[PDB]
Each structure stands twice: as C-alpha cells, then as structure tokens.
Write a protein that binds this ligand. Structure first.
Ligand SMILES: *[C@@H]1C[C@@H](O)[C@@H](O)[C@@H](CO)O1
Ligand SMILES: [Mg+2]
Ligand code: NA
Ligand code: NA
Lengths: 211, 210
C-alpha cells in the first residue's frame, strides 16, 4: 500500500490503481512455504484486511492485489475470498503460483511473451494469445509485469500492443517499471553519482538489477 | 422391364449448388433386395464405456416389420475374427416409454465387452456384429450385419476427444470425381485415394458436400 496521498492524486488526476498488499516471500523455498502455512495466515490477513479498510473509498482503486511473488498457498485462497465477500465492487488479482490460480479473477502473468511459450514446470508462462484459449479458460488477461525496461530495453514493445489491440480479452499490462532505483552518492569533490547494488558495501547484493 | 425417367433439373437442384461439375443420370449402383415378410427393418449400434475404456457395453436396438409373434427373437452376436466375444437373445417388446406403452416391434440387446479393442484411424480395430431374426426354437428368418468399431467421440472442456484423447485432424475434402467416368465411383479409385491419403499422413476426410 502506498503513501495515502498517492490515491488522492490518482483520484483527481485520473489513473486506474491496483492496490497491493505488502506480502512478498520470494526468497522462501518453495515460494509458498509461508503462504500455505496456516500459522502465517494471521500476519498475512492483516496486510490484506487493513489495506482494504484504509483504501476502499478511493475511486482510483479498481483492483485489489494479494501481494507479489509468494507462490500460491491456501492463505491466498482464504484472503481472496475475504475480499470478494467484503468488497464485491472490485476484482481481486494475484500472480503467484502460475498466474491463473483460484486466487485470481484476472490472468496476470509477469513476462509471458506474445507468441512464444515458456513451458516451465508447474508455473509455465504461456504465450498470452494461447493462454486465453486454454481448455476451460474464460478470464481476461492483464500482465502484472511485462516489457522489462532494464537499461537499453523495450525491444518488442510494439508486439504486445498489436496483440492487445487485436484480442478483446488481452486487456493490457503494467510495464516493469517506472523509475530506476539508483541512489545518489558523492565523490571526494562532492560531485553526485548514481549508485546501485553493492555500492554501499552491501553484500551479498544484486548489482544493477534494481534499475 | 424397368423404365426410369431421370430429370436433370428439379426443385432438388436448389439444394444441390455445390462447386463442382453439374451432371445427371443413374450414377450409382442399382440393385434388387429380397427380404422376408417378417424382417429386420432397422438396427442401431451404440458403444458406451467406463472412465478408462477397459469396459464397454454394446447396445443394439433392432426393429421389425411384419406380424408380431411371441416366438420371435433377436440374437445379436459379437465376433472378433473367428471368436464370438459376446451374445444376447431377447423377444420383441421394448421398455415402457409413455402412457400408451412401448414399442412391441422393437428390442434392445445389451452386450458386455471386457477390454474392448478400440477403433481409431491409428489402429482400426473392428468387430463383426451379426443381427439374427429368428424363432425361439432355432429357425433363422434372416440375418443382417455390420462392422463395429468401439470408440467414443465427445467434446469436453472445449476439446474434441476420441477415446479420451484430443484429436489432431489431418484432413482433406474429397469429392467423388473421376476424369473419365465423372461422378461415378468405383472400388479401385476409392482404395487408390485412401492409400494415397494415408501414405501422405492424412487421418480424416470430409464428404464434400453430400
Ligand atoms: C469451400 C466450398 C467448396 O465447395 C469450394 O467452393 C471451395 C473453394 O474452391 O470453398
Ligand atoms: Mg459453394
Ligand atoms: Na484487447
Ligand atoms: Na528488479
């Protein structure tokens, strides 16, 4: 959840908002070790429920998100249903555990390509065009992350937009991402420079992957 | 002496506007069939399966014309080559279907078949079903027959399945056309077409358009 003023500004300037619970357990093995554990359901519920209680009157918020990269666990299904019960006015989405689980109203993969399948075991990234028509699938597809804008990037951005326009149920996506997470450091002469992972003696680190 | 006046054009022509040569005449077989007064007038064969196709029920509905009699029976026998795998015998008289009763001139035989050999384009396993119309005490009145292929065709969850598996149709449309004989078909040409199709990895044909 963002600083409260963000929603006020989005209300007034006009931007559709995905409001997302502060739950990411990416580093667990497997990713859902905590989110499938009922002992962690209380801590998780509060991150979802208090978000909804705070932000539910903002018109700019059109979709709730259960968090990010926390696999798919039974705790997601419970909280998915909690929101659906308290606020039927907004769809609920969540990408974890394969992007099309029982805990999401929207097929919301990250970095599924336009035409090319990536058939990972358990959590494949289908071609977005193919994903829509998988046997029994009926939901809209909006990528929670796509077109990874790292450095000299956005090759093939037009391919996504051609597909979005051609396919009714391909309803766009959220680019990753808006702003480089570089930090300012100063040299011996007081001249500013842009710094990334590892530039603060921080270790282990992941270098420029924050930009 | 038979006399046949064949019209090239009729009101039927309005329903026969296929993209093809417009011809006319007696272009398929003519035959004489002799049936007894008491006769098999129709029969339907169905094959239904359990979840893994390890068990089947062959259901054969048989209809007769002629005078109904208590001594009349139908036997449906199922053969795999020279081996009879199943058989059932029953007198006529279907189940009650409504307030007026049932079909007294029909009977349905149900035959259990364990581990049936399934039909497909990949392996066209066939059984022979023989339908015997007879007196109870053993006098055959007539027999009819057909080849039987145990297979299930269904659409489930958006997929066309054959015996539980999704088909990939390698198909072609085929007209009944011969450069010399026009729209008259013969065994040799048919067989030639089938061998060529299969040799070129086709598994399916559409009877365009008749
Ligand atoms: C589809 C119908 C068929 O009869 C042909 O007319 C074909 C075009 O050659 O289109
Ligand atoms: Mg036509
Ligand atoms: Na679209
Ligand atoms: Na990153």
């Amino acid at each position: 959840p963002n600083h409260p003023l963000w929603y006020t500004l989005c209300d007034r300037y006009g931007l559709y908002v995905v409001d997302e619970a502060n739950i990411e357990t990416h580093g667990m093995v497997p990713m859902n070790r905590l989110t499938d554990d009922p002992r962690w359901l209380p801590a998780m519920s509060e991150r979802v429920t208090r978000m909804v209680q705070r932000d539910r009157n903002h018109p700019s918020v059109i979709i709730w998100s259960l968090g990010n990269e926390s696999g798919h666990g039974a705790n997601h299904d419970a909280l998915y249903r909690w929101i659906k019960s308290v606020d039927p006015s907004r769809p609920v989405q969540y990408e974890g555990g394969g992007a099309d689980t029982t805990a999401t109203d929207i097929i919301c993969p990250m970095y599924a390509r336009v035409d090319e399948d990536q058939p990972f075991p358990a959590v494949p990234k289908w071609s977005i065009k193919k994903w829509l028509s998988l046997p029994g699938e009926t939901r809209p597809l909006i990528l929670c992350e796509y077109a990874h804008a790292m450095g000299n990037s956005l090759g093939g951005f037009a391919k996504y937009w051609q597909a979005f326009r051609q396919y009714p149920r391909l309803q766009g996506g959220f680019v990753w991402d808006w702003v480089d997470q570089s930090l300012i450091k100063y040299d011996e002469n007081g001249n500013p420079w842009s710094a990334y992972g590892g530039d603060f003696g921080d270790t282990p680190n992941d270098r420029q992957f924050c930009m | 002496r038979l006399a046949v006046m064949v019209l090239r054009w009729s009101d039927g022509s309005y329903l026969e506007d296929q993209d093809m040569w417009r011809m006319s005449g007696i272009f398929r077989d003519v035959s004489l069939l002799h049936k007894p007064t008491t006769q098999i007038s129709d029969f339907h064969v169905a094959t239904r399966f359990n979840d893994d196709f390890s068990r089947a029920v062959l259901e054969a509905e048989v209809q007769m014309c002629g005078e109904l009699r208590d001594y009349l029976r139908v036997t449906v026998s199922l053969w795999q080559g020279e081996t009879q795998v199943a058989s059932g015998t029953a007198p006529f008289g279907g189940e009650i279907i409504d307030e007026r009763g049932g079909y007294a001139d029909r009977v349905t035989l149900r035959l259990n078949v364990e581990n049936p050999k399934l039909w497909s384009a990949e392996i066209p396993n066939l059984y022979r079903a023989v339908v015997e119309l007879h007196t109870a005490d053993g006098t055959l009145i007539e027999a009819e027959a057909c080849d039987v292929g145990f297979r299930e065709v269904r659409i489930e969850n958006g997929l066309l399945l054959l015996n539980g598996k999704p088909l990939l149709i390698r198909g072609v449309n085929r007209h009944e056309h011969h450069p010399l004989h026009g729209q008259v078909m013969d065994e040799q040409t048919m067989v030639q077409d089938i061998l060529l199709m299969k040799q070129n990895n086709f598994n399916a044909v559409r009877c365009s358009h008749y």
